[PDB]
A = this chain, B = another copy of it.
């Protein structure tokens, strides 16, 4: 059922912020593995015909015998699918959400310091998120491949803090990785996800 989406750019398009070796392994191996395991878990079930957003939104209703496989591999597919679309080689910091962030945090620089603090604080594997929670912007972090959509919050930006996302280039220096992320955020896609709510 589910397919590995193509990247919207070359593996080396985000250099020198994200390394081309990481982009290839992250997409062609890790994300591909999530698609493979997700297809195995939903094969022959009533989940087969559902969009991955509908599955992750309604994860709490997935049968107990496949719920962990779908939480982990469905989460992995959705989160990596959003991540590729939310990166861009020629990121401009403007648009609807940048204006909303400035209004709420006072500056982009204040927003980035809170985002970096929470992203650096996530212990073990997970994600940092900008979400809309009942019309208000919030930063949250989740473990493993958990997604805030499961708790009725709409993600508009995410950031992978699994070690596979940064180890080849940055090793233990997750703060340097978070720093490099601001250079490649696709604020056009962030706006698109925000305006859809």
CA A125 to CA B123, docked complex, whole Å: 9
| Contact, CB under 8 Å: B124 / A171 | no
Q: A162-B163, A163-B162, A164-B163 are in contact. Are A144 and B124 (CB under 8 A)?
A: yes
| Contact, CB under 8 Å: B168 / A72 | no
What band does the interface of chain A fall in when counting residues whose beta carbon is under 8 Å from B? 10 to 19
| Contact, CB under 8 Å: A172 / B125 | no
**Residues of B close to A29: CB separation below 8 A:** 171-172
Please name the residue on chain B nearest to A69 by beta carbon.
B123
| Contact, CB under 8 Å: A171 / B123 | no
Contact of A125 among B125, B167, B171 (CB under 8 A): B125
Contacting residues of chain A (131-176) with chain B, CB-CB under 8 angstroms: 143-144, 162-164, 167-168, 171-172
Contact of A167 among B68, B72, B164 (CB under 8 A): B164
- Taking the complex as formed, is A67 at the interface, i.e. its CB lies under 8 A from any CB of chain B? no
Interface bits A43-76 vs B (CB < 8 Å: 1, else 0): 0000000000000000000000000100010000
- Taking the complex as formed, is A25 at the interface, i.e. its CB lies under 8 A from any CB of chain B? yes
**Residues of B close to A164: CB separation below 8 A:** 163, 167, 171-172
CA A123 to CA B168, docked complex, whole Å: 20
| Contact, CB under 8 Å: A167 / B172 | no
- Residues of A near any B CB (own CB < 8 A): 25, 29-30, 33, 68, 72, 123-126, 143-144, 162-164, 167-168, 171-172
Give 22 A-B contacts (CB < 8 Å), ordered by A residue.
A25-B171, A25-B172, A29-B171, A29-B172, A30-B172, A33-B172, A68-B123, A123-B144, A124-B126, A124-B143, A124-B162, A125-B125, A163-B163, A163-B164, A163-B167, A164-B167, A164-B171, A164-B172, A167-B167, A167-B168, A168-B168, A168-B171
